[PDB]
Design a protein around this motif. Structure first.
Motif, PDB file in Angstrom:
ATOM      1  N   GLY A   1      54.473  35.694  98.086  1.00  0.00           N
ATOM      2  CA  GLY A   1      53.734  35.532  99.340  1.00  0.00           C
ATOM      3  C   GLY A   1      53.208  34.124  99.524  1.00  0.00           C
ATOM      4  O   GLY A   1      53.527  33.213  98.741  1.00  0.00           O
ATOM      5  N   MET A   2      52.414  33.939 100.578  1.00  0.00           N
ATOM      6  CA  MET A   2      51.901  32.634 100.920  1.00  0.00           C
ATOM      7  C   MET A   2      50.900  32.149  99.874  1.00  0.00           C
ATOM      8  O   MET A   2      50.194  32.946  99.240  1.00  0.00           O
ATOM      9  N   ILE A   3      50.872  30.838  99.679  1.00  0.00           N
ATOM     10  CA  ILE A   3      49.983  30.183  98.761  1.00  0.00           C
ATOM     11  C   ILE A   3      48.732  29.811  99.548  1.00  0.00           C
ATOM     12  O   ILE A   3      48.828  29.225 100.631  1.00  0.00           O
ATOM     13  N   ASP A   4      47.569  30.237  99.044  1.00  0.00           N
ATOM     14  CA  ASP A   4      46.256  29.870  99.566  1.00  0.00           C
ATOM     15  C   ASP A   4      45.692  28.805  98.660  1.00  0.00           C
ATOM     16  O   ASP A   4      45.725  28.956  97.448  1.00  0.00           O
ATOM     17  N   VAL A   5      45.177  27.735  99.239  1.00  0.00           N
ATOM     18  CA  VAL A   5      44.588  26.654  98.480  1.00  0.00           C
ATOM     19  C   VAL A   5      43.214  26.314  99.038  1.00  0.00           C
ATOM     20  O   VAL A   5      43.022  26.257 100.260  1.00  0.00           O
ATOM     21  N   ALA A   6      42.265  26.088  98.136  1.00  0.00           N
ATOM     22  CA  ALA A   6      40.966  25.573  98.511  1.00  0.00           C
ATOM     23  C   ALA A   6      40.656  24.302  97.718  1.00  0.00           C
ATOM     24  O   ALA A   6      41.085  24.153  96.559  1.00  0.00           O
ATOM     25  N   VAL A   7      39.967  23.366  98.369  1.00  0.00           N
ATOM     26  CA  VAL A   7      39.543  22.107  97.730  1.00  0.00           C
ATOM     27  C   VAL A   7      38.031  22.086  97.808  1.00  0.00           C
ATOM     28  O   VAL A   7      37.457  22.379  98.849  1.00  0.00           O
ATOM     29  N   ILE A   8      37.380  21.807  96.697  1.00  0.00           N
ATOM     30  CA  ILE A   8      35.933  21.757  96.682  1.00  0.00           C
ATOM     31  C   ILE A   8      35.486  20.364  96.281  1.00  0.00           C
ATOM     32  O   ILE A   8      35.837  19.900  95.185  1.00  0.00           O
ATOM     33  N   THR A   9      34.718  19.715  97.173  1.00  0.00           N
ATOM     34  CA  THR A   9      34.097  18.401  96.885  1.00  0.00           C
ATOM     35  C   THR A   9      32.654  18.430  97.317  1.00  0.00           C
ATOM     36  O   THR A   9      32.281  19.258  98.148  1.00  0.00           O
ATOM     37  N   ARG A  10      31.853  17.513  96.774  1.00  0.00           N
ATOM     38  CA  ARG A  10      30.456  17.324  97.211  1.00  0.00           C
ATOM     39  C   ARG A  10      30.370  16.907  98.694  1.00  0.00           C
ATOM     40  O   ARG A  10      29.520  17.401  99.442  1.00  0.00           O
ATOM     41  N   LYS A  11      31.293  16.048  99.127  1.00  0.00           N
ATOM     42  CA  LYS A  11      31.314  15.555 100.501  1.00  0.00           C
ATOM     43  C   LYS A  11      31.605  16.630 101.542  1.00  0.00           C
ATOM     44  O   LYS A  11      30.804  16.853 102.451  1.00  0.00           O
ATOM     45  N   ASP A  12      32.736  17.317 101.411  1.00  0.00           N
ATOM     46  CA  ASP A  12      33.160  18.256 102.436  1.00  0.00           C
ATOM     47  C   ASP A  12      32.844  19.708 102.103  1.00  0.00           C
ATOM     48  O   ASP A  12      33.100  20.595 102.923  1.00  0.00           O
ATOM     49  N   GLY A  13      32.296  19.942 100.909  1.00  0.00           N
ATOM     50  CA  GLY A  13      32.063  21.293 100.397  1.00  0.00           C
ATOM     51  C   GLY A  13      33.347  22.047 100.055  1.00  0.00           C
ATOM     52  O   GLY A  13      34.372  21.441  99.708  1.00  0.00           O
ATOM     53  N   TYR A  14      33.286  23.373 100.150  1.00  0.00           N
ATOM     54  CA  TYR A  14      34.462  24.225  99.943  1.00  0.00           C
ATOM     55  C   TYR A  14      35.326  24.283 101.210  1.00  0.00           C
ATOM     56  O   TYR A  14      34.863  24.741 102.282  1.00  0.00           O
ATOM     57  N   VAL A  15      36.582  23.839 101.089  1.00  0.00           N
ATOM     58  CA  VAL A  15      37.491  23.883 102.225  1.00  0.00           C
ATOM     59  C   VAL A  15      38.779  24.616 101.904  1.00  0.00           C
ATOM     60  O   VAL A  15      39.582  24.142 101.109  1.00  0.00           O
ATOM     61  N   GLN A  16      39.001  25.748 102.549  1.00  0.00           N
ATOM     62  CA  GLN A  16      40.312  26.363 102.488  1.00  0.00           C
ATOM     63  C   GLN A  16      41.273  25.592 103.408  1.00  0.00           C
ATOM     64  O   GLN A  16      41.038  25.510 104.601  1.00  0.00           O
ATOM     65  N   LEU A  17      42.324  25.013 102.827  1.00  0.00           N
ATOM     66  CA  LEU A  17      43.360  24.305 103.571  1.00  0.00           C
ATOM     67  C   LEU A  17      44.097  25.216 104.561  1.00  0.00           C
ATOM     68  O   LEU A  17      44.408  26.366 104.250  1.00  0.00           O
ATOM     69  N   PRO A  18      44.375  24.693 105.756  1.00  0.00           N
ATOM     70  CA  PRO A  18      45.088  25.469 106.770  1.00  0.00           C
ATOM     71  C   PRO A  18      46.477  25.797 106.237  1.00  0.00           C
ATOM     72  O   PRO A  18      47.089  24.988 105.540  1.00  0.00           O
ATOM     73  N   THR A  19      46.952  26.991 106.540  1.00  0.00           N
ATOM     74  CA  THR A  19      48.242  27.409 106.032  1.00  0.00           C
ATOM     75  C   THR A  19      49.410  26.584 106.589  1.00  0.00           C
ATOM     76  O   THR A  19      50.408  26.398 105.886  1.00  0.00           O
TER      77      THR A  19
END
Lengths: 203, 203, 203, 203, 203, 203, 203, 203, 203, 203
Positions: free
Chosen positions: A171-189
């Motif tokens: 299935g589709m890959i879900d990715v999240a990036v966590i930084t102090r600047k932008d916080g927790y961000v789930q990347l758009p599919t």
């Protein structure tokens, strides 16, 4: 299932795929396995879905409550320790799960937590039936000096390799990036699909 | 047993057959497996009949209580979470059931819930012994653009094929359609029968 | 595994996929599961690979020998009976296989043979872990009056559905058509890929 | 499975349905379970398909051989005794079958043979998972004074009742009538179908 | 044991035999398995004698209490629901019973309840080791248009057939008829005995 | 254990590590798991050492015999079929092994053979406890267009990654390159070490 | 796992490796297994990580509380006795651990505590899968006259030898020295690496 | 039991202790576990005494026979291959033993052979319950440059350390040195005692 | 383990060795197994260390408490009766121990207490795996007339013989003598060594 | 059972008791367990009486045949080796015995042989349930300098002590002395009784 968390200099990246099986039977192609549990904290789930989903609800509720009570987010290690205590307490009637907790406090962290509440911090970690395939890729290609952009590409590569070889992953890959600047961000599919195309990958 | 739930643009369609067996022994030809549990919420049951029927009574009671208390219907995802919690709490002495919860709040939803409280939202889902046959038909024939009338035909075709191949499935096909306009509505038997005749099918 | 045999007016169509698993581990993406075993005879294999491959070698050899001795091809029912006898002999130390035997003598035939040598003729049949999904598709869609071209599309569709829902099935779809006029013909891969695009499918 | 044999004054009537299952999975809708094995002798099969098919081939072979050697047909009781001996000889590695042997020598006879070679003559008998239902109908409705057309309707009634209540039974009913005047005669489907209508039944 | 309940237009007919065994040992020839539990409600018992006798005492007690408290009889469905709840509550320490609950509220009803509290309404139903034989007779002979005297002969026929073929069934047949006009009426033995003669039966 | 075989345009590359464990107990750090078995044929072994070593001895003996008798090398596919037949013949008393057979006839081939004699051709394959890690790396980095030097680097990387994550793998990497021009050549240890340094690796 | 504690004249030295496995699978290369639990007290862990980690948290909490309450440090023997009472209490639901407790009160001590609370003082001790290799080295090379520099080399040697032969041991060696003058001091990694380099070792 | 074999430049040294137990029970303090089996070949035994003694007699007999037939001593690798084939042949009814074979042909060799006939050459090896303690000493202290006197000391140290920690090891240490110049030489007890006294040891 | 207690005219002598094993593995050579629990009372322990150590702490605490409350030492028989009641109370979750209680009240006593709380007085007794060897010495050599010096020698002899034949026994012999005049006296190691030297013994 | 064999300068002494039990039940008080098997060779038996007795008959037959054939007595070591070969051959269907073989060839010998044909020479040995008590006495009181009169007393003492503590031992002590001068001589009962009386013993 395949999940992965990696740390970089000022970032955590966490990713999963979405397949939910009962033996060979692919019941769901889009289950969710990656959750935001706090401002700069994400969690991945593997193992028995019911047990893991209860833990996700608990962690959401407890970290929100802790933040309100303390005026600060729970440190990432404190999250892992909380889970460690909760899971070891019911050792003999366990939550049958493998968890990754990733986040940013003063530094990036990834912790791997087992069904008996064993918790170990690592530079990177993978869980689920697809994890040995992911450790292959990571062992070979991971670098601490990677950028977020290369880190995102690596985890897609690693989970794509696992999907090719692990029939319980897909299935589709879900990715999240966590930084102090932008916080927790789930990347758009659509952004994930574009990276997939460019890396020369399939499914 | 065969049950199915599908979402369309602004509707949910739920259907089951009616056979109750003890092994090969068809004890009941007309069991009921499809239930309204709230204004715009339906539920199918598969697995141990006494467990499932207790759950149906509870869910009727709790969803009626909740909306009297809240002055709104429990959101569909809340219905699925509730069941998820109840089922997981007793996973070592379980309700031995598979459940479909379908309904419409701001959107249509189908949720599949297992005996340990694992709950996954899907575009469509099927439970019971006849379910792999249903998934064959739906993989091949489902479209997100179907009209309600086409959806009704699809589920009739899917259950009829499961009935031809799953000896634990049989009897008449029960269908319910859920919309914001009419709420949950169980279709008249004569209507289902007319569609069976006009699709070129049996039973 | 997913295999399928269907008869039409003057044709037999047999198809498989190619995934070889060790539990969840996809070891090979391109195993072979469809074999020509005589001039107008094919065989598909499901179950323990080593048992099935040994049986394929026997059958190729015995049918070659038989046609040399008799100066005519072994009748399809004779092929199935031979296998039935062989497999039943060793019922307590079995070949752990499901077999389909298809071909043309005076008429098209598909036989389905189990690990105890139970052999039954059918107008269509499916084997492997993906078979219930195929049975679903064939129940709603199969017609005796189909042409070869639409029969080929039907099996591609059926196996495409199995592959979506059976994690033990996957890889390229292999198809052979058997006629008196043309013999046993395996369709070229690029023709199968063309049919997959035009039907609107994946892989 | 459901099979039945009845004796009448100078006739034996034998009937089956045709469903072949693996557990709940209806693999074949038209298996064959009723065979002529000699001029005035029929046999029905229940239990493991590969075992029963091997026994049918052996019995056709041996009664043909015996006829050529003795210049008379094997007496029905000698048929039941041969089988008795064969099955008992391998009781610890058995043919997992239930058999009916019916026919005319100087009188009508029906024999019922079990997997250990136990053999009992009866005025009527039934085998397979559907046989309790048949015994019900026969206890209630059988008369030794019935004519053949009445006998035929009786077995059709009995197997239809079994098909209603035994999920492992189904498909078209096959009936044979055995007399000294006409020998063994399998009734044409259209004739069985016509009797089903005039009796008020289904399938 | 053999018990049966049938609905007719404005009537319920309920019947049992009376044999009580431990294994093959006929301890009692005249046990009682048919009880009135309310003005227009009967219940039959099958399975473990001590469990079923406790349930009979409880049901007589509670329906009497409920009647006094509500000033109307418990609706038949409420009776089946109470039992459903009670049996399911102790599923893991169960009452090892099969129950029929029959009676008149605004209509005739028969309910069949299992040891886990699964409860299904039917037009007719049978329990105990002799019930497959009864289902045979009923499938073959039941008509919704039957009169009471016809209904009575039917159940006598069905249980006699079961007594012939089920060694755990035997003894005199008890029949009750329930109507709004006459209430619950147990038929006198001499009347049952007389019908057995005129039908051509035994015991 | 970790073994790998890959094909390239005109070459086969096969490699292993050397660790022999008894559970956790590292008995030998330099066992040999890669063998030349014919002029252009190599074999790797995984599983029970004594079983694997016996098969190595047989295969060297039999391919030498065959070459002498036929005046040509056994075709690679014939080597795998031979093994397939031998391993299947004793599948209830098995060689507890997983084998890779690689080499050049008119084309490069790698075959993977299991303990029941199941044999499948592939462009690449890996066996042993370290194999999932290898498949991760190969999935991610393998290309059919690689040169031999590139392919040698790939298998060093794949095995190095497995050694990092599989405690039952360890020791010096053995590598053989097979070409028609040069035959089977085991690369000198000094040369593997050199590539290990240049690639940025360990052990 | 490999852990070791030795006593000298006025010193305790404790060391571990860092490998965390699930069977053959090396999950974490840099887990932590040696902890300061009081001013002059350290503890090593072996066995189930979640059990051990909970016990590390309890001992840190309780030894701190005790010291606050008593205004002196808990004697090392008292620490061992506390542990021994706690583990024995729950011996039928045990902490599945082996523990080393070492420190200085009026004298140096090392205690070894098992999963049933058995506790024994010794001059040196080792726990985990690597401990037999360690006891080999210490039996051969331990002297009570050693200096702190010598004992540090000795435990680096013991553990290095264990890592060569125990695949469940691996990674960087951790070492703490405990004295009255400096208390519990963790040696810097650069100093252990320098000693590994000077002594002629690897891994 | 503890046994050990080591190779040096032009020598093999082999040694055992002598304890024979039945669980905790020391039956014999002076068993023999080291045997000369050919001019330049010794063998140690561990595991089931009866099995190991039978193998010693066969080896002495076969190597003598082979020397007579070939007019050269069997090469050490041939001795190990002979044992391999023998032990593997009776894999399912095994000699429950661990063997070391040591000797000089054109070079010194030590081979280790398990109960399934797996055979591996090493620079050194140990068998028996005391072997892990021995591996610790050897890893720490073995050098390929050692002289014979130094190697003799090493193995005495190694076995002495094993005796201290392994209660199934005990009694006098037997040592043999094998060279081309001197042959197999069993060292006098008085010489080993003098070394145990010199090196500062016990027993 | 070996422990022993003997009575003489006005004395009790008790002795143990010190070996602590985990199967064959000698974890500790110097454990303590003989304890003073009151002014004129000693106790030896055998069996599970954790359980036995907990009992030692309870006994020391309770006998001290009792002495304070009663102003007399608990009678030796009362000590044994206390242990009896305690051990019997937890019979199904037992302390897995064998105890000797020895002392002087108005007379010398030795009591032997098992894991079910069975308690018997004897002139002498031994516990542990080494006890049968001890009973042999005592039966042959014990005299009720012996002096203290002679009794001390006897028990040294007895334990020394056990150490020679029981591999779970070993290490230094601890001896205490209990008299009214001198109290419980633990003999100095130097004195026991001098007796081991004098009597002509080992260890 | 208790048996013992000791060697002296030029003598072997062998003794047993005579008790035969089935569990606690003393069937025979005067069974025979010591046998002369050759001119200067005796044997004791322990374990299953029927196995032992058959082995006594074989050894008497074979040792006589050998001596006739060789014109010399089988060496005692050869007797032990013969036995060891025979018992090992049938080790998976074993003689369930422990054997002592003692005698004089050029020197005195005692060998101990187990049920798998393991055979070890010792200076003394004991078998049966009483043997641990015996080893107690011999460890304490055996001297290699003893005279035949002393050794005889010693074994009477060993066995007497065993009979006091082993309820499966009992009855009259049998003793044989073996020398070159007199051969194998059974001591008269009156002489053993006189020595039991003189030494101060019972039973």
């Amino acid at each position: 299932t395949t999940t992965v968390g990696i740390t970089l200099k000022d970032a955590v990246i966490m990713a999963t795929e979405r397949r939910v099986t009962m033996e060979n039977f692919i019941m769901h192609k889009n289950g969710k396995k990656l959750f935001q549990i706090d401002t700069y904290t994400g969690m991945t789930i593997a193992g028995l879905v019911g047990d893991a989903q209860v833990l996700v609800r608990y962690m959401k509720a407890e970290l929100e409550l802790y933040r309100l009570q303390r005026r600060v987010n729970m440190p990432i290690e404190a999250v892992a320790t909380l889970l460690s205590n909760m899971l070891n307490q019911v050792k003999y009637m366990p939550y049958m799960v493998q968890l990754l907790v990733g986040g940013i406090d003063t530094a990036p962290h990834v912790f791997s937590i087992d069904a008996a509440g064993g918790s170990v911090e690592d530079i990177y970690a993978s869980t689920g039936s697809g994890s040995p395939f992911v450790y292959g890729v990571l062992e070979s290609q991971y670098s601490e000096k990677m950028t977020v952009d290369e880190g995102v590409d690596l985890v897609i590569r690693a989970i794509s390799a696992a999907k090719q070889r692990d029939s319980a992953s897909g299935g589709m890959i879900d990715v999240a990036v966590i930084t102090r600047k932008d916080g927790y961000v789930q990347l758009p599919t659509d952004q994930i699909e574009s990276r997939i195309r460019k890396l020369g990958l399939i499914l």
